[PDB]
Design a protein around this ligand. Sequence first.
Ligand SMILES: N[C@](CC1c2ccccc2Oc2ccccc21)(C(=O)O)[C@H]1C[C@@H]1C(=O)O
Ligand SMILES: N[C@](CC1c2ccccc2Oc2ccccc21)(C(=O)O)[C@H]1C[C@@H]1C(=O)O
Lengths: 737, 737
Amino acid sequence: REIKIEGDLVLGGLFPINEKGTGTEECGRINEDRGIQRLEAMLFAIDEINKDNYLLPGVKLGVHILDTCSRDTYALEQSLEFVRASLTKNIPLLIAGVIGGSYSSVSIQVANLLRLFQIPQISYASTSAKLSDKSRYDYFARTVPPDFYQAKAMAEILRFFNWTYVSTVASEGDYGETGIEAFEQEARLRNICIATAEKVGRSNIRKSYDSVIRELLQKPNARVVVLFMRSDDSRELIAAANRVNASFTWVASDGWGAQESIVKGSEHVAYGAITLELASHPVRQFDRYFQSLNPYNNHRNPWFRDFWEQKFQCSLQQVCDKHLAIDSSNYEQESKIMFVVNAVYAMAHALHKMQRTLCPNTTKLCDAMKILDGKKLYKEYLLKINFTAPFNPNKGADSIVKFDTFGDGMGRYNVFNLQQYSYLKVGHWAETLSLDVDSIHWSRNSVPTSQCSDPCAPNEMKNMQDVCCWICIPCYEYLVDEFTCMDCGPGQWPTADLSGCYNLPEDYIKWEDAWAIGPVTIACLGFLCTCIVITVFIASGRELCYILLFGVSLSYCMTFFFIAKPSPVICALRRLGLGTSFAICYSALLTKTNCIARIPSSQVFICLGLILVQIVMVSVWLILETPGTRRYTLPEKRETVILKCNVKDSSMLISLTYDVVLVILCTVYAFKTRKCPENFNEAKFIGFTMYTTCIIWLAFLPIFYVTSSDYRVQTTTMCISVSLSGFVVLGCLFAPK
Amino acid sequence: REIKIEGDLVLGGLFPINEKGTGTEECGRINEDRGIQRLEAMLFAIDEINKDNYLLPGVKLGVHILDTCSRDTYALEQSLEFVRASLTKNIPLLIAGVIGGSYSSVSIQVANLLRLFQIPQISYASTSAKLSDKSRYDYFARTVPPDFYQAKAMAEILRFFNWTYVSTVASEGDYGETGIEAFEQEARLRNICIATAEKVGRSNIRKSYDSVIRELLQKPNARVVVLFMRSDDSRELIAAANRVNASFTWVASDGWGAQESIVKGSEHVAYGAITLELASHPVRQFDRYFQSLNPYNNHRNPWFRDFWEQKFQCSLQQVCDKHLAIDSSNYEQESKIMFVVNAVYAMAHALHKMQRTLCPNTTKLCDAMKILDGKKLYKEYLLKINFTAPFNPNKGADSIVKFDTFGDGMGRYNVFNLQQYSYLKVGHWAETLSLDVDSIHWSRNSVPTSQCSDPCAPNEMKNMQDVCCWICIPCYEYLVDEFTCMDCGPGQWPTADLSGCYNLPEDYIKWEDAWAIGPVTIACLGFLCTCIVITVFIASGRELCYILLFGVSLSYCMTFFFIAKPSPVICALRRLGLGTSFAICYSALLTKTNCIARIPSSQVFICLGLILVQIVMVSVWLILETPGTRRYTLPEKRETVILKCNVKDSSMLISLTYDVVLVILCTVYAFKTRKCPENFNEAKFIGFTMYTTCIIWLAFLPIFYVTSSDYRVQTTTMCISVSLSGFVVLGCLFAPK
Ligand SMILES: N[C@](CC1c2ccccc2Oc2ccccc21)(C(=O)O)[C@H]1C[C@@H]1C(=O)O
Ligand SMILES: N[C@](CC1c2ccccc2Oc2ccccc21)(C(=O)O)[C@H]1C[C@@H]1C(=O)O
């Protein structure tokens, strides 16, 4: 019927004593664990409340308890009796609040009804996430944490120390549907991707056996399936996976819990699972009180007599004995009794603080408590209570009953693990994990990684991504990005860590590569040959020799000029040196050839001859200002980009053109060999060699310009000019000595 | 008290008979317009329902009417009597549903209560947008449209034919706050920007006088302020704008409505406003019924006797007379009576269709209607009714009472306009506007535009945008975008509409620019001079003349070659022609000069001379393969990019270098003028002119290459060569004739 024991201030109680689904009446099959167990706990807490002298000395709390039959329709009809007394229209019971709850559907409906009439409601067990939406239930503060706190818990068991980052499984209804909706919002917001995310909806359907296959198909990035599914469906999935004989790490939810019956005959399939309980401490004072109850003593509860006729399979009025009593051998405590006493005390403490403030200096209630401020009672004292859970003498930091800003209890779960087969706690999610990692027995005897794409090394760092699945592309030029390569300084270039682009100074120089030594020997041989001639002969010929000697000296400088490192001005100056040296050598022959065909002072002719060489120098100087005396680097498709002076110097060939005309003009005077003195008096043997040397020098130059390596083409051409210069004098001075 | 007349099926009625705010009791000041007027309409509809024989023949509808006192707290306490009869716990009234409503706060609370017990509720007047959220009120279908339908209406009065697109004003509470939230979602989603969007919250505050200033400050893009504010606040704003003497076009909402009292003493300030009424047709049958009521006849309604003592300022039991009666002279109809009868008939029609289906072949009710299916009644018949509004004999398409999918009525408003000062309907928002634009008297006697940024023309199309405010940048290359310019074919380029970039063929050619005519005359003069010499002289000299004639002919081709349009091969071939012509002219002098210094057959020497000219041709042909016989265009910072052959032809100067050496080599033979026959036997007068001509030709060429215009430099240089060729022969043949 109803428990309506009188008191100064009366509390409300809705417990699923009878069970829904019995048939036409639907209000049969009285439930013990969810029911009398919880019901007597609320009665037990009230007995302790009035016994205690510090909560409410002059206020003895009354009780108004009504059945819910585990059905919302019957709960709403019953719950009207709480409203009926208040808002005057015997039942003279000023119901301060109700401690109803249990099944979320039942608690949601009474939350809608009691919100309208401004009565605070505390649900001892309703882990639904919908009830935390205060825009619809603003008079509903509960002691148990919601289920979206499990989503925020499992999504942190996967991120402890480089843990798994994949896969998800759901279930239909509201538990699986709403919880997974929170799991995804906790995985996306903290960098976790998901694999196949099916939803096993009905009890026994072909989807479940296909669900394992659909999860087994996604093999590489799914070895941790995040179950968020109910107990009956969990059995169906595990048995389905048992038949296929697969292996996973079932990161489960409260639905799986710590029940051994979930995995029966399939323990090795689920070995290594991770599940979360609700982390409730059994009240030991109530355990003695509940076991001390007697059918002939319990008169306050009308259901106890019928309860005594149900749990013993006897008729109190099979015939059971008189000395039968509840004992720890028969049945144990309900896993949520702590949350019931923490809900009765959540009002007595709230009512005590309200009584002290609004009616001070009075042991009993004052006239202001004849009308109870529903809004003030909820969001001033009830929503701000901070006492410690009674009858739990451990008195740890977790033993508080602080209500959240949304009227939720403090989230506290127990991470479990099935190791061979029994459940043993290996963690505690209060606000951050405290997992005993060493004690965890994993599925495959080692910690799974469950990462889709392996991280890419400093080499092969380029990635084509979903987010957790990239492609390790073999291409650090600027640490351009994890996902791109424009290939300025790529892996196919001599780059460096995060820095190396084509800017690298890969200039190529010879620096005495063992080939330039020959030009020095050739220059030395010519100087020795020139010194012997000077000594053996020490006029027009003397002046010509001096001009020829200057050309020989210029050739040596050119060999050394090319040997020097590239410079914007040094390289350009050395380029003009080659033209001046060639003109000087050619000019002396022209001057010598012009003096022979003279049948007009010698000094004036010598000055005129110098004027012929000065014109090329003036043109050479003018040509230098044409490029601004700059140098151009030499990049290419390959590495080792060179940094030298100007390349493709067509003006250098233009300078040779003036020498070629002078050389061609010298051949005009070279045709007078039959008209010139032979073997004496300025013999033409040297002139013939000079003409041949010019052709050889011209041929050598085109060959070097034809190639692109430029190893020793410039040095080789200079050696020919240096060798040719000594050859003209050597051929003429063959008879002397 | 309550009207509880018995009937087969009893309907519920909640009307704000008494008015909130009277003080301690709060349930005084009986309200007539919102109250007895609406109350008697529901009674009137019930009387017509039972009188009619087509709605419910064997079913006489009962009435259960309760007061709400225009307060949610009293409404919820009263509304429990509807629930009390059902869900058996005399009042044996099976309440099928309730026709309560009025003030949104009252209707919202009873919607929460009656949703739980599965009773359909129809509100005759609750235009709140919260009630359309079926996730919270799934048993609430109403006849009046919500207020977010006004947002979808005003945001379409601004988009009829290139109308205004700016500004917004709001108000505090729920009407202004929720409606403007919908107005912005209808403006953003259909391309409308907003100006200053303040919220005049309290009754009389300094914000309102500042609100006009804050709206007056944003002058250019705010001349249409979209009011969504209540009646009392609207008076305060308009009076505030009256003191400052501003002018706007107040696009208002239902709060302003058609009330003349909103604008009193400030009509000229608000002249031109646009406001929306609710577009309700006054029921004329009820107007006679309500006026026919008597205090000694109306016994069903207990409030009428007190109502008779309130509207007449008399005591029925000041003393009023017996013949006093309600008349059209005293008071008119409530603006929502139509929505009340459309709510009673919304259930009788819904119950009739339910009765026909569930209990067919029976004039009265059957046993299945002893228990009423709350869910089936709502979302099968009530949510799908389609009849026509009774007592409105216009019977237009708007006279239907179709319920929306969210249990809303059909949105139908009346666009108004205050023109001098009275309100006259100038539109009707059923689903699309039907504004009589010609009849609208605007604020400033003309249609306001109210656009922030003027649209940019095809010129100056570039824009820097908020969205509605851009900057008309003076920069159609490819119609790149409304908001960018990379300046490939910009306004500072000869572009075209949407197409013109630098790809435009702006090649520059002469095509007989009146300057090339001189080269033809010079060529003609030389041919005539050459023909005279040939005629007067018609051997070594003859062969030399033929070689010289070939050079003259080549010069004419070069002049015509440059005149031709640029070609990849034609332009390149003409470039090589200039070098061949110069070499041919120089070669003849060298051959002529070489024959004089011969003291070795004449035919062999003639062949040798041709070999000297063949070398340049071979080099010229080799040089052509160097560039591939291609042409390069000439672009620049300005327009008119040229498309010609290769430019900066350094190889062309290289060809002149060979001629210069030949010319220099010819000067060697030119020094023998003192040793050559003078005035006869191959006189050297022509040779001296040839040397001078070469220097002049060289000087002319550098000058043309120095410039960049290239107007007639090439033609001028060719003329000098053509003139020089005739000059050498003319100077030699001065004595003959
Ligand atoms: N915890 C419950 C049930 C919870 C749940 C919440 C919402 C929807 C479905 C749903 O079903 C499951 C399934 C598995 C585990 C927990 C739940 C609550 O109502 O919150 C409540 C029965 C528990 C009790 O009374 O002891
Ligand atoms: N239309 C009303 C009032 C509507 C409104 C709705 C929600 C919040 C505030 C609010 O205040 C205003 C102000 C100006 C115009 C209309 C409203 C409704 O409750 O919907 C209802 C009184 C009308 C009647 O019963 O005749």
